[PDB]
Design a protein around this nucleic acid. Sequence first.
RNA 1: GAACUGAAGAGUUUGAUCAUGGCUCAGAUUGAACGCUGGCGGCAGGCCUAACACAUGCAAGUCGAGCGGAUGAAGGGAGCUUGCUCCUGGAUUCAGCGGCGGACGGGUGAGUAAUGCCUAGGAAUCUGCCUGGUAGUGGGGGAUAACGUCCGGAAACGGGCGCUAAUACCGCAUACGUCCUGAGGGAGAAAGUGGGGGAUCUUCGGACCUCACGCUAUCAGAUGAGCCUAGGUCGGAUUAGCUAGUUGGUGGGGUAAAGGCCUACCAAGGCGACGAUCCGUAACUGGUCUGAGAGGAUGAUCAGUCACACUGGAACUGAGACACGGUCCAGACUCCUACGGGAGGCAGCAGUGGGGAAUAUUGGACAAUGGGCGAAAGCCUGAUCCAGCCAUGCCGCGUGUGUGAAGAAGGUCUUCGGAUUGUAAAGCACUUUAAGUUGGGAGGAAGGGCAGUAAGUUAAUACCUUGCUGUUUUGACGUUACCAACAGAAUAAGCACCGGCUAACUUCGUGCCAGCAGCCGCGGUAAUACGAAGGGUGCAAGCGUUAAUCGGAAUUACUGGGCGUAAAGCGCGCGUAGGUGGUUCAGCAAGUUGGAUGUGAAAUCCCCGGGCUCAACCUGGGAACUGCAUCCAAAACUACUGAGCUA
Lengths: 87, 56, 80, 205, 81
Amino acid sequence: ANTPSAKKRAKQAEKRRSHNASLRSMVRTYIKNVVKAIDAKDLEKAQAAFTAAVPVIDRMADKGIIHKNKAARHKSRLSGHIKALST
Amino acid sequence: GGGVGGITESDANLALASNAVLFGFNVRADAGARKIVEAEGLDMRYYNVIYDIIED
Amino acid sequence: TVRTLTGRVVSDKMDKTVTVLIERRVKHPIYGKYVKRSTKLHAHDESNQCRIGDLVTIRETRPLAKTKAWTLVDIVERAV
Amino acid sequence: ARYIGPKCKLSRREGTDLFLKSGARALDSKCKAENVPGQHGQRRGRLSDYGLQLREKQKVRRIYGVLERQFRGYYQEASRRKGSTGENLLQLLECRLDNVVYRMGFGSTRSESRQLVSHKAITVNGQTVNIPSYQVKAGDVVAVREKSKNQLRIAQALELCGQRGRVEWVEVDLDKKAGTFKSAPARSDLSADINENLIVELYSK
Amino acid sequence: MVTIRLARGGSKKRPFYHLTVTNSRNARDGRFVERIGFFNPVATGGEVRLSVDQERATYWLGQGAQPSERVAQLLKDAAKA
RNA sequence: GAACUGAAGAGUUUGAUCAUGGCUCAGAUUGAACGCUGGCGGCAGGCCUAACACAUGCAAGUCGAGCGGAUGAAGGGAGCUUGCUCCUGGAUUCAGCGGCGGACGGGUGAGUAAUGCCUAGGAAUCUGCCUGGUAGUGGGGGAUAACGUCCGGAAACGGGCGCUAAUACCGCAUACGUCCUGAGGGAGAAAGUGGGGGAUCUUCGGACCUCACGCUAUCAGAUGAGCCUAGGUCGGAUUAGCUAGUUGGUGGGGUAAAGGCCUACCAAGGCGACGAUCCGUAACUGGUCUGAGAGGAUGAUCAGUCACACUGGAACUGAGACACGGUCCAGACUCCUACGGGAGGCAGCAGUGGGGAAUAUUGGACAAUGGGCGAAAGCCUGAUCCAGCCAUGCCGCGUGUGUGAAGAAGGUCUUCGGAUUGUAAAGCACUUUAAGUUGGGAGGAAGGGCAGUAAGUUAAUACCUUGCUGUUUUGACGUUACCAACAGAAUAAGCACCGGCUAACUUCGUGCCAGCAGCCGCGGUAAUACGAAGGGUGCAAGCGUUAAUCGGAAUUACUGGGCGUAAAGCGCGCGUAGGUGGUUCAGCAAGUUGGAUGUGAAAUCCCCGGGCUCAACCUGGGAACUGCAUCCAAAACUACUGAGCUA
Ligand SMILES: [Mg+2]
Ligand SMILES: [Mg+2]
Ligand SMILES: [Mg+2]
Ligand SMILES: [Mg+2]
Ligand SMILES: [Mg+2]
Ligand SMILES: [Mg+2]
Ligand SMILES: [Mg+2]
Ligand SMILES: [Mg+2]
Ligand SMILES: [Mg+2]
Ligand SMILES: [Mg+2]
Ligand SMILES: [Mg+2]
Ligand SMILES: [Mg+2]
Ligand SMILES: [Mg+2]
Ligand SMILES: [Mg+2]
Ligand SMILES: [Mg+2]
Ligand SMILES: [Mg+2]
Ligand SMILES: [Mg+2]
Ligand SMILES: [Mg+2]
Ligand SMILES: [Mg+2]
Ligand SMILES: [Mg+2]
Ligand SMILES: [Mg+2]
Ligand SMILES: [Mg+2]
Ligand SMILES: [Mg+2]
Ligand SMILES: [Mg+2]
Ligand SMILES: [Mg+2]
Ligand SMILES: [Mg+2]
Ligand SMILES: [Mg+2]
Ligand SMILES: [Mg+2]
Ligand SMILES: [Mg+2]
Ligand SMILES: [Mg+2]
Ligand SMILES: [Mg+2]
Ligand SMILES: [Mg+2]
Ligand SMILES: [Mg+2]
Ligand SMILES: [Mg+2]
Ligand SMILES: [Mg+2]
Ligand SMILES: [Mg+2]
Ligand SMILES: [Mg+2]
Ligand SMILES: [Mg+2]
Ligand SMILES: [Mg+2]
Ligand SMILES: [Mg+2]
Ligand SMILES: [Mg+2]
Ligand SMILES: [Mg+2]
Ligand SMILES: [Mg+2]
Ligand SMILES: [Mg+2]
Ligand SMILES: [Mg+2]
Ligand SMILES: [Mg+2]
Ligand SMILES: [Mg+2]
Ligand SMILES: [Mg+2]
Ligand SMILES: [Mg+2]
Ligand SMILES: [Mg+2]
Ligand SMILES: [Mg+2]
Ligand SMILES: [Mg+2]
Ligand SMILES: [Mg+2]
Ligand SMILES: [Mg+2]
Ligand SMILES: [Mg+2]
Ligand SMILES: [Mg+2]
Ligand SMILES: [Mg+2]
Ligand SMILES: [Mg+2]
Ligand SMILES: [Mg+2]
Ligand SMILES: [Mg+2]
Ligand SMILES: [Mg+2]
């Protein structure tokens, strides 16, 4: 960089990336738990994982880590998969 | 051909057109003149003392 | 309302989709003669009810695949 | 630029009057105006159609004292305007400020009226104009600045314009040297010797 | 945002202004949305000093367009008359 | 009322003629270059070549009214004594955290023949700041820079330990809208600052009331972008086959959003002589130059879109970038160095070398219009406004005006008589534009500070917002535009050509030489063609030459040409695609015709006006944009459908 503004922006951007990566991995792991539970044909596990995973998905969409459309899509598809599994 | 400054394409292909020897005293050739000198078989000598030039 | 295109069916070997040929007649820019041009479109046939030689009508919708954004609404001249 | 030099070889070469001196004494008894200028003066030398067209254009230009580029501009404007460019060119030439000052008797010739206009001695609408190309409109009042009303030049110019013919399209107020431009003079108000068809023919090639 | 400002035309030391409705991040004399009149700092004679479309100006001010300082002053002056 | 109105030919094949046919010329234009010459101003333009390499300056910062900390005025004072110390207070200034901006403005045209551009459409999306509604801002928690401390390094600077705030960060509470879920139910927010105050308690620390700014969910609007379809967009066939995620279906994943966008199975499809693939070339458009038009050529300056930022990739942050003065990796090339070890990217504004026939100043100011931040003063701004250089272009003005025959002197030619340069000069008399000097003198300026008053907001003559009033304050250009006075004719004309085409002629030198030349052609002893001199003809602060486009060229002929002998009918059949279709009714409405609506950016071209003393130039309204799409109507012709008739 050549000016102080660029250096400060680079420093702040590195901090932002460090903060955001952990939360994104959090959301991914919470979704993957539900996906694995569904793939194993386990109902009670599926409801437990879905109930644990919906609040974090909504909270992280609200914080701005992901877009709310993605949260709605994930919720809809997980709900459909679980409801189809129950029958 | 005389001149002051580095060896250029103009004097390189001025030497090419006269079967001349290209002498540079305390100067260097640039990239284009180097390309031209490599392309043909022009002989180019560098120097930093005038008596080396006189001897050659 | 909705604008449509009318043309012949030239291929139905694909699944749930048909190839439609649309004939247009355009005046030549410089010499003034009228020449005929052809357009080939891939239309969506949900129930595979169109055969080669049929004269049908289609409309425009959102893309359904790549190179497929037209859907047929009526078969009006059944082939022999 | 401007043509500055012998202003009578032009008359001999064109072969017409082509007023350039004050007209006080004469034209014949100053130059023997029957031979073309130069050593080969006695030769006649009948010339071609292009020569006739060129001579006609040169005669008009030397009458009104304008150069070639300004004349081309005048021709383009006359062609752009409606109604028979042939006399449109004359309408437009006859409205220049120096020509109008000449026609009002303030100057003996066109060069002296140009001298007057360029040297800030003429007001058009009560305000000074010094461009010898200003197209005066119908109804303007060309006058003379009060500090320039005692020049003799105007006195001789007026007393000599008293006898050259009645223009009958400008009214000059002799006592205090104020004029008026009623309108542009129609083709029938000018001399019927200029063949403007030759000019239009020359430029349409 | 969307603003109403003056676009400069005319010539050297002879400025003329168009009252233009533009996206703010455009060139001063670049693309615009609509022109709603003009302003003449010199005028004189038969030239008018400034003219504005009342209808278009009110419509654009109702849609959330922020006029500049000069546009505000000139528009209030035009509304005064 | 107007928006047009418009079209030339000549030279050269022959002893001569008509035709065919090529070559050449007369016109208008350049981002031009060169040669000779050169006074002024106004308005524009100025690396077309090496997307070659770059020394040195500047081109993006702002907010203390978000937050700690350290800098600590004036003062009130206190002591001792001329000055110091101390305290309270504290005005100013910011290295750091944090919020915005940095994705704009500016540059260039390498790549790209179609994920580009142009025209017309549509459906499945997002959109900071901006506008109008709806519902809120309740209560906790753990950190960390700055800082202190300990080492190493030439420096750049780096590392460990401890300590502290926020509109930094994370749970909890609640949800008018919002998410998903089928009703049933479940899920998800915030932040506080600044100016005043009646009554109450409290440290009017404050709570509480009020205003302003701010923050959180959400709807609509505006703006901006993403996505899809149809048509069009250079040359080549001495380039004929191309394609296996390829073409389509299903399940799943992924995106803000449709989609082979990706993946796993199933099928064998998709494109192409209406030119696929390949090769070469090239940003596209409004527009510009020519042309009577139709066309041809072409994308400088101006405006819209696209792509690029030393070369090749990748993502992060963010509403928005795969990021023009940001990050990471690799590479080529320069440099530093103390030899341990790092830095760089002018296709931003000036500037340099280099290449070239060829293209300019290390300028001034943020006064004006814009952009970023701020609450507001205000700060920043090579955008912009202006200056400098260059006849590069367009336009305008000067270099004087009248009289003047001894038709002076000199030159040139001569039939030796004279003619011509020539009213030209001199003489005489006038004028002072531009330039020089002196003195006056606008307009580009809206606003800002302070003070007062009146309305609205409340709960309040508070703060604050808004009208108005008074005072003060602002211009780089700039010795402005413009105006008045003084002096004197004083300070200012060159270039090409003169055989025909093509306006303008003779003498003297030379002798197939020296030379000229666009095409015919000149020059071998009287050369209007070479070189001078007299004279003349065109232009004129310019004039010629060279290079390039259209025209003339009806010489690629759609408008608008030809093929017996000048170039040109395949050696002759048959036949595929294609082009074309004898004659009657009836229908339909693709072509065709008429009308309406929307669109066809602005500028430019054109018409009528208005401002610069005129013009160039600037500008108002109109016309036009000949096209495209959608509706309504008509049925003669062509197309299509049904039924006939026989030439
Ligand atoms: Mg949120
Ligand atoms: Mg599909
Ligand atoms: Mg001129
Ligand atoms: Mg002959
Ligand atoms: Mg360049
Ligand atoms: Mg600071
Ligand atoms: Mg740009
Ligand atoms: Mg390019
Ligand atoms: Mg290619
Ligand atoms: Mg909650
Ligand atoms: Mg909170
Ligand atoms: Mg927060
Ligand atoms: Mg604030
Ligand atoms: Mg297309
Ligand atoms: Mg696969
Ligand atoms: Mg799917
Ligand atoms: Mg994205
Ligand atoms: Mg696609
Ligand atoms: Mg699929
Ligand atoms: Mg091809
Ligand atoms: Mg290229
Ligand atoms: Mg023609
Ligand atoms: Mg092109
Ligand atoms: Mg450029
Ligand atoms: Mg542009
Ligand atoms: Mg790169
Ligand atoms: Mg992001
Ligand atoms: Mg980019
Ligand atoms: Mg950047
Ligand atoms: Mg740079
Ligand atoms: Mg530069
Ligand atoms: Mg470079
Ligand atoms: Mg050079
Ligand atoms: Mg030059
Ligand atoms: Mg400014
Ligand atoms: Mg400050
Ligand atoms: Mg600075
Ligand atoms: Mg500066
Ligand atoms: Mg000039
Ligand atoms: Mg020159
Ligand atoms: Mg004599
Ligand atoms: Mg002023
Ligand atoms: Mg002749
Ligand atoms: Mg001789
Ligand atoms: Mg000749
Ligand atoms: Mg000669
Ligand atoms: Mg030429
Ligand atoms: Mg032609
Ligand atoms: Mg030609
Ligand atoms: Mg024909
Ligand atoms: Mg022929
Ligand atoms: Mg023959
Ligand atoms: Mg023969
Ligand atoms: Mg035959
Ligand atoms: Mg056939
Ligand atoms: Mg028929
Ligand atoms: Mg047929
Ligand atoms: Mg337009
Ligand atoms: Mg006027
Ligand atoms: Mg119109
Ligand atoms: Mg009918």
